[PDB]
Amino acid sequence: QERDPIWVSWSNAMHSLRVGDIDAAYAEVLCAGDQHLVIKLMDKTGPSLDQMSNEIANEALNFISQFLLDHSLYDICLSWSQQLLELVLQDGADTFGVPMELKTEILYNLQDACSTMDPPEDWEGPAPEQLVVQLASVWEIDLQQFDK
């Protein structure tokens, strides 16, 4: 008889949040494997790329890239994408040290979501097409070179 280890991880993460260590909270949950706990954490904190190390930001963006393929997570993905754009505009295109492959996956997956799903009902940010056009520009990726 022992607790599911994911809840011990969650407890460690909640303590980290209590003391303001968002980076450590993410490091714990992103490592615990469990997708539903990653979503649970993101739902609680909101977009948190401004409080993360490059290493943890890259782990989080890897999840966002995968989440973009799921229409139930579109709101979350747009919110994080918007924050990412704002931060790369402010702190520099390469501030987070995201590799070109991941940059490309994020754009490709966001463009795909944009093409197939409608903006969530409560979404109030830029049109999804504006996010992907602007992010592609900052990252110097030509969206029209993706094949249709």
Author numbering: 717 to 864
Text of the article:
The molecular mechanism underlying this microtubule array reorientation involves katanin, a microtubule severing enzyme, and a plant-specific microtubule associated protein called SPIRAL2. Upon severing, SPIRAL2 binds nascent microtubule minus ends and limits their dynamics, thereby stabilizing the longitudinal array while the lateral array undergoes net depolymerization. The domain architecture of SPR2 family members is distinct from CAMSAP proteins, as the former contains a predicted N-terminal TOG domain, a central coiled-coil, and a helical C-terminal domain of unknown structure. To gain insight into SPIRAL2 structure and function, we determined a 1.8 Å resolution crystal structure of the Arabidopsis thaliana SPIRAL2 C-terminal domain.
